[PDB]
Structure formats: C-alpha cells, structure tokens
Amino acid sequence: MLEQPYLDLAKKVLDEGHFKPDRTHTGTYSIFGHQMRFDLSKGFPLLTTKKVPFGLIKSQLLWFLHGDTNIRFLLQHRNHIWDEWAFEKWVKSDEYHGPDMTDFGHRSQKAPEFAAVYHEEMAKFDDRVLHDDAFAAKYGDLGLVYGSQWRAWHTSKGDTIDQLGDVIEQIKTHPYSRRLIVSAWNPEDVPTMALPPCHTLYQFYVNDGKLSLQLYQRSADIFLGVPFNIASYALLTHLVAHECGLEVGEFIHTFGDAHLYVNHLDQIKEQLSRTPRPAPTLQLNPDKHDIFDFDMKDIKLLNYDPYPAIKAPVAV
Template identity: 75%
Template sequence: MANLEQPYLDLLRKIMNQGHDKDDRTQTGTRSIFGAQMRFNLSKGFPLLTTKKVPFGLIKSELLWFLHGDTNIRFLLEHNNHIWDEWAFKNWVESSEYQGPDMTDFGLRSQKDPEFNQIYQEELKKFDQQILDNDEFANKYGELGNVYGAQWRHWEKRDGDFIDQIKNVIDQIKQTPYSRRLIVTAWNPEDVPTAALPPCHVLFQFYVNDGKLSLQLYQRSGDMFLGVPFNIASYSLLLNLVARECNLEVGEFIHTLGDAHIYSNHFNQVKELLSRNPYDAPQLWLNPDKNKIADFEMKDIKVKNYQHHGTIKAPVAV
C-alpha cells in the first residue's frame, strides 16, 4: 500500500505559493502555472484522492459514457451523474424556446446570490427531468456536440467516413506495441467554436515496456481542485481497462498539464485539503470474467479499501 496522491498535493502547494494570479473566461479568477507534470505508479494502487472523498461512481459512469461514444447527457443522468449538466443547460437557456426566469451568467450569479441560486437549482432540476422523460427534448438539448465520446469513437473524416480511435489504438498496442504512434486526440480545430466545452484533455499516448502499459495525458487546462482529481482517476481507470484488453500489466499514468490553475473561490478549500494527511491508496477491482472494454458495465468496476477524509464542496466555474 502507498500514498499515491503526493504528486497532486505537491503541485497544489506549488501553485498556491508560486502561481500567477490571472483573469479567466469564467470571470472567477485563477492562480496558475504553465507546464506541470505528475507521475503515478499504478502498480502500487489506484490514485483516487483520500484527502477528500471523490465519488468514484461519477468517474466510471463518465468514462463509460466516453467509451460508448455517447455525447448526450441522458446516460449520465440515468446514473445520477451531473458533471456535464451546466453545459447542456446553458444551451437550453440560451435557446429561443426557453421561456423561464433569466439565467444570464447563471454560474457566477448562483454563487453570489442565494435567492437566485434557489431559482437556478429549480430550473436545472426541471431541465434534467425533461432530458430523462422527453426523447425529443433530450435529443435536442441533451446533446453536447463533438465532445470526447465523439472524438474518441467517431472522428469524422473529410470523405464522410469516421475513425474509431479507441479501437484503432487497442489494435495497434496488440500488433505493434513498440510504436511511437499510440495516440488518441480530441482536439479538432474545426469543432472548437461549436463544442459545448472545447476538449481540455487534448490527447493521450500509450507506451509499452517490459509487459507493462503506461499512458501520458496532455491536458491544456486543469481545474486543480475540482476537475483534476477526476481526471487522474479517469485516465488511470482507462489505462487499466486498455491494459486488461491488451493482456498487459499497468505501468505509470503520467499527467502533463498546460495551464494548471486553482480558481480564486477554491483557495480556502485547497488550504483545508492540504491540512489533511493522506491515507494509503485504494485498489481497483475489475470483473475478472471480462476482458473487452465494450463488455464492462458499472457493476464490473469497483474500488476496494477506499479510506478517505470528508467531502469538500466548491462551486463549478462554467
């Protein structure tokens, strides 16, 4: 057993102590550094944060959503996952069909105005229920466009055909494990202007050595307190699933970030997190009867011996 989250805690401290205070798209403000890297040895455990509770169910449902090639939030809502709600909701309230209360800048306003936040939460709850109950509404307003699921599994070609990058990279790992081209990319300049959220996880690359599979992610933008703990666990899970299908052991997950930032309204939460002592990392359990990614369901993926501190809540910047 081992403390696997130390690289993450060290990077948080570095940003708090040495980062640059900057304005940002959400108008919240950040403290950031440019260019950072964390390394996690997955043979020693699974790097799910223990200094705060991280809901693993949300991580695995989101990753399965990506791997299914899905880009509609209905699957997520069916698994009580609200990670992507705000971006779909934004499309709804900015449409001509929306006739409810004014939701302009709902992300910032909900943080500063408790009365408005109550109205916002009620509208968001109604929106989610319509996605679940109404097929036509879900098809129109639950759709996020060419986000990760589409780019990974259904990259559109100029000739009208498509590329399944996940299938291709798994085939390449099996056939040419020495290749330096074991890459999946999500960044398509043509799609950036119309995507609900341009990909933060720009590309990832696999590497095989001594029967072990490693993965490096390049992330252009990382919300260090809320998002990055999910990203660490999600890509570590992805690495485990691909290793299972390719009959390899797991090696390292290497997380490289461009703009690694802490939002200014997360500073107190970060200080609280850094005051806590981490526990040993949990262990990942994958159903031993399944070998192909396509066969895995929620019940086939679990973490064991997950000891953790309590939840620390913080607002999402949209």
C-alpha cells in the same frame, strides 16, 4: 503514498505561482509546464486527503467509451457534471418560454431565487431528457464531446474514425510503437465550442509487459478538476490493459496551465494538513473482457478511506 504528486504541485502553485487574470473573472495562480507520474502497481490514484466521488468518475468515463454524446445516460446514472451545458442550449431558443434562467451561472450562486427556480427548472430539462425521446434527441445530445472525439472523429468525406478503438487494436497488434495517440483536439471545430477539449491528447505505451499512458492537459484546475482527471485516466489505463492481457505500469499527467483560483486557497490549505492514508485498490470483473461491454457494476474499488470532502466554491 501515491497522491503526493498532487500535494507537491498544489505546493508549487500557491508558492511559485504567479497570478493570472481570467475568463470567469476571479484570478487564478498559474504555472506552465508540469509533469507528474503515478505508478499504478502500488495502488489506484484517488485521493485519501479529500473525498473524490468514484461513481461520477465512473459513469462519465463509461459514457465516453460508448460513443455516447447524450446526457440521458448520465442523468439515469445519477451523474450531472455536464448538465448546465445542455441546459444552456435549451434556455436560448424558440422553445424556451419559461422563467428566464438566462446567464444562470454565478447568477445561481451568490444571487437570489437561483437556488430554486434555477435548480427547480433543471428537473424539467433532466425529466424531459429522460422521457421524451424527441427531447433528448435534440437538446440532450451534446454534439461534440469526448465521445465523438474518441470514437467518431469527423472526417472530410462523411466518415467516422473510431480512433480509440483502432488504437486499442493497434496495441494488441503492434504493442512497441510511439504511435498510440488519440487526439481530442480537431482545429475546425475548436473556433466555436463553449469548452474545447481540456484533456487534449494522450499517448499509450507498452513497456516490457506493462501498459502506460500519458495525458497532456492544456488547462487544469488543481483543486476542483485535477483529482478527478487523475482517476479517470488511471481507470482508462486499467481498462485498456485488462483488454490487451497486460500489467499496469504508470499513468503520467502533463500539464499546460495548471492553476489554482483565489476562491480556493484557504480550502487547499485545509487539504494539506492531512497526511495521505493508504491507496485504494481496483478489481475489474475478470470474466468480461471487452471494455465497451463493461458496465457500472463490473468495476470495484476496494479499501478506500477518505478524509472528509472540502467544500468547493466553484469559479463561474
């Protein structure tokens, strides 16, 4: 069925993959250079062999398309993907006078009262972020995320370039070019960023009547992040298309380093004894047209039947 691309690249790696040392010191298994494509007419690429949550997926992409770079939207929307990130600027300053959640990362996991205390201090960041307007303002703003990359790229002369918006319109106007590229990689900001864009660039394309998209990813977690990244880029392709009056052709995913962690091998093996069930379907509220106007409810996923969700030891 549709997710076989995913099972085949997971085969690739734990077989042809050659180990690589790492940033949070649990080795990985890496391949470099890899493409796979999913034809969005057969159905939507979420995985039936592991539960992948389409609610977090959804909230996250929608925050991207508003230009939002503030976790307040994500926290009132039961999304926490990005929490740690901002909680990491909080704990290192003038203000943090509390019980040191410093270096909290693996420290939370295979370590002491970093089940509570850590996980009890987040209530404090996530409450104040939801309430104190003066709080989110500053500590819940996350600076440079996909929002500023996609809709407010920063130029020399102060201005903000909505390069995604410009793009979408470029599409309705000149559907046949090679030039529908949004880059999330800006070199002067790259030097000093905690995570600089992993989803690095993407190209849109009009086929004959169909839209396609191609994502270049430079670094990609096969078990943990990849399932997700597929559904968010296939959502984008449905969303841009409903907007320009189009049919959906394929989403193509090109990889720089796709890599599995040793933390994750017994667990992908487990995925692998399951045999993919039918591909789910997507219905978009047809009344509304204009994707920046869409909201949680306007995007339904029909006929999804998941194999149980495999338990993720993260790395650090």
